[PDB]
Design a protein around this ligand. Structure first.
Ligand code: A1ASY
Length: 470
């Protein structure tokens, strides 16, 4: 900084392309280590394993987002390329010293091994360790990928690196092999259906408290298992979505099925009094969702009542008692003005909770369309890494809620019930949508002043048992 030291002697870029001089044609920074704006994947690998210092934020973000610009096998081969560093060509005077014998190696070569080769190779081992610790799904999906890595680390010689090599193997071994309650969870609630009679489970026969409890437990596990990589690059809306985003797709599809299920229960309840009781039950489920801070569950219900087939059922909503109507309307207002009220309430609740997942998926899609994958250059175009960082910022917001277990006991039969809901049946989404609205027109025809009379579907009481535990 206040004096320029002797430069480090490096091998030729014809035998080690990672030493090619930095320029605006292969790497750009954002105008405290510098923030990388983009570059070639070679230059990103170099800064990923830079010899001058460590960069833990770049390593984490790279390993979460790299799949949007580089293949897992491509990355392993790049790290092995980085590791096998040739030494500079010895000078004529250096060769003479070796020939003489019993001569300490050149000061330049000692500097090179100590200030470059060793630090770079250690940064690579650090990358391998972060990879298998936090992204081991790359190795579950690709078996040749793992065997290559394990083959390579077994080729590493040197006492100074054996601690690292054995730490990587210890992590892999822990991975390859892979409920307590601090205070007693409340007793399971049952209504008309009884334990074991899973064939009779339905919206009005299960207990409303337990429906909310069990959906919260299910939606909590689904939310917890989403990995940030499943959201980068909108890979869940792309060709290999089933492989790259399995947990995220299970979260979206649960939400789709449960929202269509609530709609189905309202419209298919043709008797007017029975239908008002169904809607009131769903609002009771909504209130326990809010008591449990399950905003995903809340907004799935808001989503159902906003569907056209339900929204038009004016005589049903008008028959609702004023109190349950007010609860529902407060919930609906959470979503208004781009979820303005929802966002201030999320920031003020204590764990455990289940956030609304749709706001992340929507905000990520806008970043995807609002930032180009590349930066434009005369020659080769650079990878836009700032874009990946921006998406990584949002995926970090998802992870801060995923370590919050609920103090609720799992009911296995009800758990299978909600995992196996198939409201559409054999119809397509299009076919089912038309069928719902057609059934809505039937149960409350246009411009009717009194809902038509339909026979009651069940013989049991419409009275809810309420949301008060016993
Ligand atoms: C006429 C047309 C606009 N209808 C009205 C009924 N309706 C809803 N009403 C209400 N609230 C409510 C109900 C009855 C009331 N009676 C006096 C005030 C009052 C307020 N909330 C919602 C929906 C739809 C689902 C989202 C939540 C659907 C649209």
């Amino acid at each position: 900084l206040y004096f320029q030291e002797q430069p480090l002697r490096l091998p030729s870029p014809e035998v080690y392309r990672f030493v090619v001089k930095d320029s605006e044609e292969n790497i750009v920074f954002e105008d405290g280590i510098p923030i990388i704006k983009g570059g070639t994947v070679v230059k990103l690998i170099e800064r990923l394993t830079y010899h001058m210092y460590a960069d833990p934020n770049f390593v984490r973000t790279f390993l979460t987002t790299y799949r949007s610009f580089c293949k897992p096998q491509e990355l392993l081969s790049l790290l092995i390329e980085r590791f096998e560093i040739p030494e500079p060509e010895p000078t004529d005077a250096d060769k003479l010293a070796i020939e003489k014998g019993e001569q300490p190696i050149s000061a330049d070569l000692k500097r090179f091994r100590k200030e470059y080769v060793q630090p770079v190779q250690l940064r690579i081992l650090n990358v391998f360790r972060h990879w298998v610790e936090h992204h081991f799904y790359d190795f579950e999906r690709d078996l040749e990928l793992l065997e290559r890595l394990e083959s390579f680390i077994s080729s590493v010689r040197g006492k100074a690196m054996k601690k690292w090599v054995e730490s990587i193997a210890k992590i892999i071994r822990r991975k390859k092999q892979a409920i307590t309650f601090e205070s007693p969870p409340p007793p399971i609630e049952w209504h008309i259906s009884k334990p074991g009679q899973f064939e009779t489970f339905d919206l009005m026969t299960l207990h409303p408290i337990e429906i909310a409890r069990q959906l919260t437990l299910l939606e909590s596990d689904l939310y917890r298992k989403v990995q940030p990589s499943e959201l980068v690059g909108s890979v869940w809306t792309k060709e290999d979505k089933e492989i790259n985003s399995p947990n995220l797709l299970k979260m979206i599809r649960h939400t789709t099925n449960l929202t269509l299920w609530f709609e189905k229960c309202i419209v298919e309840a043709e008797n007017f009094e029975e239908r008002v009781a169904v809607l009131s039950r769903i609002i009771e489920i909504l209130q326990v969702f809010q008591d449990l801070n399950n905003f995903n569950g809340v907004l799935e219900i808001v989503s159902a009542v906003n569907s056209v087939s339900v929204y038009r059922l004016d005589h049903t909503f008008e028959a609702l008692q004023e109190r349950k109507r007010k609860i529902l309307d407060e919930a609906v207002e959470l979503s208004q003005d781009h979820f303005k009220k929802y966002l201030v309430k999320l920031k003020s609740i204590n764990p455990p909770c289940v956030p609304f997942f749709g706001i992340y998926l929507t905000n990520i899609l806008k970043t995807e369309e609002g930032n180009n994958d590349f930066l434009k250059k005369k020659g080769k175009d650079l990878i836009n890494f700032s874009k990946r960082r921006k998406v990584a910022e949002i995926t970090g917001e998802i992870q801060q809620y995923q370590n919050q277990p609920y103090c609720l006991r799992i009911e296995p039969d009800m758990r299978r019930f909600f995992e196996n809901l198939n409201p559409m049946g054999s119809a397509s989404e299009k076919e089912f949508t038309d069928y719902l609205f057609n059934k809505s027109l039937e149960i409350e025809p246009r411009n009717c002043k009194q809902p038509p009379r339909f026979p009651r579907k069940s013989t049991f009481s419409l009275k809810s048992p309420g949301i008060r535990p016993n």
